[PDB]
């Protein structure tokens, strides 16, 4: 996250860290949507142009975390994966359309002060909250400083970072990039501002707090950017409500 | 789905304790001033 700030303890208790076994590295962010199910970007699991194609055995999710590196004894829980579900029409070749993936935990996780699931939007919540100018919140352990030639950024945080960003009008998103954007994406950010989510933040949640019931709703997933923290553009997010029928399909089956 | 749905989105250390975090006000302000 560029130009964010340190998360408070328990500020984002749905934040999941996708973690690679061997070698041990942070891969991506993700989100906890129930005691059993974790949501992330498809491109965190599968991206041929980078030799990325992970089995369930390659990864482990870490939940309840705050520090990027410290083992948080009796707070963080480490879960292994039963099954990965990648959207079958995920479009990595062109624009990352339908950049969504589910992971089923082998074993349900226990909720605590530090671990709690985020809500998924229904239609009304999405119609109300997902509007240009409204702000959501992104969190992650991705890099801290702007990069031009890649979305990675530079400088690793010691603690989970947070930034609030406004949703941008669809025509503006479209004019800001040569890449074909779809209804399954939206963009967020302030022109002239560096606040941004970087590659290491990918797969993590874009969340909004409902003014009606005080619940937090995941509206997006950090999907892609051109550079990180640049002054002239915006970041792109998977539109979670628009893919909700696929999510429900996977979960029910 | 498993447990979590009814109680989703309410944070043990914030909403459940009637405590607000340091920047959630900015989110609410954007609903009123952002359009
Ligand atoms: C990913 O896993 C293996 C390749 O090593 C194979 O089962 C599958 O076809 C691969 N898929 C992609 C997208 O490369």
Numbering used by the authors:
A (entry chain B): 16 to 36, 36A, 37 to 60, 60A, 60B, 60C, 60D, 60E, ...
B (entry chain A): 1G, 1F, 1E, 1D, 1C, 1B, 1A, 1 to 14, ...
Paper text:
The catalytic activity of thrombin and other enzymes of the blood coagulation and complement cascades is enhanced significantly by binding of Na+ to a site >15 Å away from the catalytic residue S195, buried within the 180 and 220 loops that also contribute to the primary specificity of the enzyme.
The crystal structure of thrombin in the E form reveals an intriguing pore defined by the adjacent 180 and 220 loops that could function as a gate to the Na+ site. Indeed, the crystal structure of Thrombin180/220 solved at 2.1 Å resolution shows that the pore is occluded. The rapid jump is not consistent with loss of Na+ binding. These structural and functional findings rule out the pore being a gate to the Na+ binding site. Replacing the entire 180 and 220 loops of thrombin with those of activated protein C also produces a mutant that retains M+ activation even though the pore is no longer present.
